[PDB]
Design a binder for this molecule. Structure first.
Ligand code: K1A
Ligand code: CL
Ligand code: MG
Ligand code: MG
Ligand code: MG
Ligand code: MG
Lengths: 194, 194
């Protein structure tokens, strides 16, 4: 019933644009929206984010997260490894690459989501959430070498999956980090399950 | 180590602005970033709220109440937790309970409320509180609930069993063109992974 009639460029940068979208609401009334897009995307989606399950025997499973200064937030955020999918890359390979670049972890794909929206009231940005396990007992993951590209500065933080929500609350409580929404959402459902 | 140096306005819309952010990188080098921000955020601890509404109902499996709406930035229908912006002076819990009633008709009870969490921190400063709310579906208030959508709001309620949420979401994505929100998908993945 609803649909786009037109888009108007308001402002373009090297990475992000701001558009004015005209849409038909369901009553047959024309309406406007200020919408944000990435300039970079071709791709099944803009990005991937990796849920990395570190499995070591005789240890808790951990979820592997990254801390990065995020200039939009003006502070440090805890997030799932993530980055944009390069032209002609597959969502899975982007996942394994970014996981390796940001953590040093060599991992295995378990499952891959369809494209999911990041903030659909504001942007069109989408990602593939890619669940990956990490055999933490394999010698290649024994002393993992994070290979950040230019401009990235990433600290790795592994947290036990069985207490993930409580561990994140402590980090917010004490470190004044911002936790990412998808991460928090995952941590919550761990608690809410069953 | 890192911190903001200056933020220069690039373009201001009615509800969204683009900014050129200058920050210090952790090598002591000045770098810049293009940032998206809302123009609405006042004293609100976050821009918005999203509600994780657990519909509880005697001799029913617990459901997660979701909404389906046209999202202009996306040019399509999206499945999301109930959500809205926090009004000036409104508490996040108060906004969650009001947005949930407006969008679904259900009258909830607060369970918990997150710190402010970042929506898409490589692109924006946007934050939310993720507020968990239980709905007593046995209560007669919650019997045949009527959405009260505001001006230009057109919302469909989709209640899906917690114990089968991801497969039920995958099923809906299978049968039509629509995107699942990443926080909903993340929570559905954690329910499978626990
Ligand atoms: C009132 C508000 N409405 N919105 C949503 C919106 C956006 C984004 N562009 O057009 C509209 C309308 C806010 O962000 S404050
Ligand atoms: Cl797993
Ligand atoms: Mg990244
Ligand atoms: Mg990277
Ligand atoms: Mg809403
Ligand atoms: Mg609303």
């Amino acid at each position: 019933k609803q649909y786009i009639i037109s888009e108007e460029l308001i402002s373009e940068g090297k990475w992000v644009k701001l558009e004015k979208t005209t849409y038909m609401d369901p009553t047959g009334k024309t309406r406007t929206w200020e919408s944000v897009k990435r300039t970079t995307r071709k791709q099944t989606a803009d990005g991937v984010a990796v849920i990395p399950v570190l499995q070591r025997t005789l240890h808790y499973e951990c979820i592997v997260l990254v801390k990065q200064f995020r200039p939009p937030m003006g502070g440090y955020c805890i997030e799932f490894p993530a980055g944009l999918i390069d032209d002609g890359e597959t969502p899975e390979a982007a996942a394994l690459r970014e996981l390796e670049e940001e953590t040093g972890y060599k991992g295995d794909i378990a499952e891959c989501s369809p494209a999911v929206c990041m903030d659909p009231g504001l942007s069109n940005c989408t990602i593939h959430i890619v669940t990956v396990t990490i055999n933490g007992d394999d010698a290649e993951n024994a002393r993992p070498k994070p290979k950040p590209g230019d401009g990235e500065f990433v600290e790795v933080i592994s947290l036990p999956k069985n207490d993930l929500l409580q561990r994140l609350d402590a980090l917010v409580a004490e470190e004044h980090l911002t936790v990412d929404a998808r991460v928090y959402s995952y941590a919550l459902a761990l608690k809410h399950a069953n």
